């Protein structure tokens, strides 16, 4: 007798494993719909005896599987799992060296922006609500980052090789972060329209666009008003474990002891390359696999991260 059937497990979350008896005369596709083995699309291939006992990813095709997928990924986007697997097939071949004491990514497939995201996240006090991200994030910190990168890509709506942006990616990822108690209060004054207090929560409490300087947000920054004037605003209260300050790329000085980490962007509107700046015993520039230690830094910066716990202004009235 030749082997005619094998047992395998199917899954949408790599936790709940569903036993299947596979007919070796049919493709995986004919039995399960689109099917993946460690990210590889095996929809069109027939089973091999060596597949016995292995785990295959499938698409959520009934209410139980849809619920498992929602519970794990925190999205109802039906294209998600397929995009995640498509990315994973490539990211499993990336290398994740330890550079400046952090897990970095050796350059491949225009992944510099992802390396900068990964490096930043390891330095923030952040956790993810979606179990897929939290579990992958833990593994990534130790150097097993292929799954985390594939997830970031899928959550971002980016494919492997696509040119990306750190701030855009962070906006997508932080939607799944533990920011429900993050709070920001801003005092806003327009000479025409008057005063108001703006309260922001979640992602909007930790991300700012317009200046790289947390000090400047504290002391006063210009912001457009609906009337056409420039109003001024300053930070009254902040409750979060970090803040991310972003601005269109420009030359900026970074001084050890005054920030957590940052993204350098060399380039312009068309094209650019993202590197990571951090500090340990001195300033570090981490460009994928490559470290440069620095005694000063003045260069093109787009995002600066700062530690926070709780801040309250001393500006009166």
Asked about 112 being catalytic, the answer comes back as: yes
Asked about 273 being catalytic, the answer comes back as: yes
Of 227, 279, 219, 222, nearest in space to 247 by CA: 222
96 binds, among Zn ion, Na ion, none (CB under 5 to 8 A by kind): none
Tokens at 268, concatenated: 């312009």
311 binds, among Zn ion, Na ion, none (CB under 5 to 8 A by kind): none
CB of 229 to Zn ion, least distance (A): 5
Binding region for Na ion (CB under 5 A): 115-116, 120, 132, 135-136, 208, 218, 234-235, 243, 263, 276, 286, 288, 313
Of the pair 26, 193, the CB lying nearest Zn ion is at 193
Neighbours of 297 (CB within 10 A): 19
261 carries a ligand binding annotation = no
CB of 136 to Na ion, least distance (A): 4
For β-strands 242-254 and 207-209, DSSP reports them as parallel
Tokens at 11, concatenated: 């899954």
Kindly name the residue from 51, 90, 112, 303 that is annotated as catalytic. Answer: 112
- The residue assigned the tokens 């991300």 is 207
Of the pair 6, 120, the CB lying nearest Na ion is at 120
Of the pair 103, 233, the CB lying nearest Zn ion is at 233
Q: How far apart are CA 83 and CA 132, in angstroms?
A: 14
Query: 3-class SS at 195?
Result: strand
227 carries a ligand binding annotation = yes
130 binds, among Zn ion, Na ion, none (CB under 5 to 8 A by kind): none
The DSSP code for 240 is S
Q: Give the side-chain half-sphere CA count within 13 A for 217.
A: 26
Q: Give the side-chain half-sphere CA count within 13 A for 186.
A: 21
Of the pair 46, 139, the CB lying nearest Na ion is at 139
**Backbone dihedral region for residue 220 (phi beyond 0: left; psi -120 to 50: alpha; all else: beta):** left
Binding region for Zn ion (CB under 5 A): 190, 192-193, 225, 227, 229
225 carries a ligand binding annotation = yes
Which residues make up each annotated binding site?
A: 190, 193, 225, 227
Which residues make up each annotated binding site for Zn(2+)?
A: 190, 193, 225, 227
Name the residues annotated as catalytic.
112, 273, 287
């Amino acid at each position: 007798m030749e082997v005619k059937t094998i047992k395998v497990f199917t899954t949408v979350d790599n936790t709940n494993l569903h036993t299947q008896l596979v007919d070796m005369s049919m493709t995986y596709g004919q039995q399960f719909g689109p099917t993946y083995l460690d990210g590889a699309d095996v929809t069109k291939i027939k089973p091999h005896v060596n597949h016995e006992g292995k785990t295959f990813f499938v698409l959520p095709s009934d209410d139980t599987l849809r619920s498992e997928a929602f519970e794990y990924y925190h999205t109802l986007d039906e294209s998600f799992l397929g995009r995640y697997m498509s990315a994973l097939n490539h990211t499993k071949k990336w290398k994740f060296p330890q550079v400046g004491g952090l897990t970095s990514i050796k350059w491949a497939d225009n992944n510099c922006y992802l390396s900068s995201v990964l490096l930043a996240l390891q330095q923030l006090e952040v956790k993810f609500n979606a179990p897929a991200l939290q579990e992958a994030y833990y593994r990534a910190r130790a150097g097993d980052a292929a799954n985390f990168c594939a997830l970031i890509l899928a959550y971002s709506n980016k494919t492997v090789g696509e040119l990306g942006d750190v701030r855009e990616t962070m906006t997508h990822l932080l939607q799944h972060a533990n920011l429900e108690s993050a709070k920001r209060v801003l005092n806003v004054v327009c000479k025409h329209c008057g005063q108001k207090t703006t309260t922001l929560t979640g992602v909007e409490a930790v991300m700012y666009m317009g200046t790289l300087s947390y000090d400047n947000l504290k002391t006063g920054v210009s912001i457009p008003c609906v009337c056409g004037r420039d109003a001024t605003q300053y930070l009254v209260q902040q409750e979060s474990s970090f803040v991310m300050m972003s601005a269109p790329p420009a030359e900026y000085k970074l001084q050890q002891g005054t920030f957590l980490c940052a993204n350098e962007y060399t380039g312009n509107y068309q094209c650019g390359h993202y590197t990571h700046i951090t500090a340990k015993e001195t300033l570090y520039r981490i460009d994928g696999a490559h470290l440069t230690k620095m005694s000063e830094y003045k260069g093109p910066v787009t995002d600066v991260f700062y530690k926070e716990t709780s801040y309250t202004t001393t500006i009166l009235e």
